[PDB]
Amino acid sequence: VSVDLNVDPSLQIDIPDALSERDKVKFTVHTKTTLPTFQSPEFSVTRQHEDFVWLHDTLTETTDYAGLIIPPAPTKPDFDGPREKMQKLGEGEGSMTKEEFAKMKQELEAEYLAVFKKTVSSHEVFLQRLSSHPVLSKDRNFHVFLEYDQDLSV
Ligand SMILES: [Cl-]
């Protein structure tokens, strides 16, 4: 076989759920850790795209990391494709039967969901990459990002 094996890793991060309200995304960032450095071995916080941008910016400009490979920022969530397509669909409502339109409305909702899912992955991959870096996983701004249980913006 050919296989990548992880045994009792000390830091695991994922985004198990997320919420879109008028195309504004809130990510649940859930962490599991066996490390002393964290207040708790398991916890979740709520993060927005700008929080991730904040974290990436502040790592990039950390003098000590200038020789390190910092994983790329996740891209800003963008629902313009699905939204514009749904608008076009609505304009064409008269040319179409009730059940044709229903079926297509459902298909475009699925298109929106696939965009959502993709931006989730992008944000999650970034955190997982940071958790795997021997130096960056220890960064205190990263820790603040994972655990500060209030609005990181303010
Ligand atoms: Cl957003």
From Swiss-Prot:
A 1,2-diacyl-sn-glycero-3-phospho-(1D-myo-inositol-4,5-bisphosphate) binds at residues 20-26, 79-85, 93-96. It is found in: Endosome; Early endosome; Early endosome membrane; Cell membrane. Residues 5-152 form the PX domain. Disulfide bonds: none annotated. It comes from the Eukaryota. Belongs to the sorting nexin family. Forms heterodimers with BAR domain-containing sorting nexins SNX1 and SNX2; does not homodimerize. The heterodimers are proposed to self-assemble into helical arrays on the membrane to stabilize and expand local membrane curvature underlying endosomal tubule formation. The PX domain mediates interaction with membranes enriched in phosphatidylinositol 3,4-bisphosphate and/or phosphatidylinositol 4,5-bisphosphate. Involved in several stages of intracellular trafficking. Interacts with membranes containing phosphatidylinositol lipids. Acts in part as component of the retromer membrane-deforming SNX-BAR subcomplex. The SNX-BAR retromer mediates retrograde transport of cargo proteins from endosomes to the trans-Golgi network (TGN) and is involved in endosome-to-plasma membrane transport for cargo protein recycling. The SNX-BAR subcomplex functions to deform the donor membrane into a tubular profile called endosome-to-TGN transport carrier (ETC). This is Sorting nexin-5. It comes from Rattus norvegicus (Rat). The chain holds residues 21 to 174 of 404 of the full protein.
